[PDB]
């Protein structure tokens with residue numbers, strides 16, 4: 001049967017839905033005993049590399065983890081599936097109204113030459129995200145500070161998101177890291193600053209704390225996966241099979257997030273809502289036994 005299971009909950013909205021839906025399916029469907037570990041990309045990958053826990057890492061954004069392939073080779077982790085099946089795109093953004101009022105902010109060089117247009121500030125992703133390493137590398141490669149752009153490190157994904165909302169309310173400038181599709185970007189039309197042509201080797205270097213030779217590249221489009229420890233896999237073929245199926249298209253994730261905001265729903269309430277209304281999506285994720293358990297508890 002299924003006993004003790006630990007799973008990361010990453011510190012942003014889609015990630016919460018992912019972990020909450022997974023938890024519910026594991027507990028109700030397979031009688032799992034699930035410990036949700038609040039986490040972030042960097043300490044989470046660090047934690048499995050060192051303690052072989054937690055069992056399940058998700059969402060795992062692969063855009064800026066250049067050493068993940070190696071981790072999987074050494075058999076420290078195993079990729080089950082892309083949990084956001086459409087993927088996502090990270091970048092540096094300004095509000096649409098700003099890009100329309102002053103089109104020169106649509107390229108990084110344009111911004112660097114006229115920092116007042118963005119209020120002399122860049123909003124950096126928070127400590128614990130792989131993106132914080134990249135942004136920090138890019139700030140250096142473009143010499144933001146030297147050009148009068150202050151790199152402001154947000155304390156969390158929440159305060160990063162709120163700084164957009166605040167700026168937007170008053171139609172003020174904003175320049176910083178974010179990603180799409182997200183609720184924030186659906187609610188506040190943003191435009192991606194052109195950071196030049198993608199370069200795999202430059203980005204790999206930007207993604208590594210120890211690579212000093214930083215260069216200019218935008219982020220690649222992200223694959224976003226659920227991963228597990230081969231130990232947990234060996235032990236729980238049924239959960240692995242289920243987690244190999246558990247996945248959301250961006251439309252599906254959007255539809256859940258919206259519902260959770262139009263109500264005051266907890267993450268748990270959103271999960272129940274998704275499962276209750278989307279049998280056609282998830283029925284195939286679970287096995288017959290689990291589906292018996294779920295059929296009986298869900299309504």
Ligand SMILES: C[SH](C)CCC(=O)O
Nearest residue numbers: 041061129130131179
């Ligand atoms: C929230 S994500 C879009 C990226 C996560 C990370 O950079 O560690």
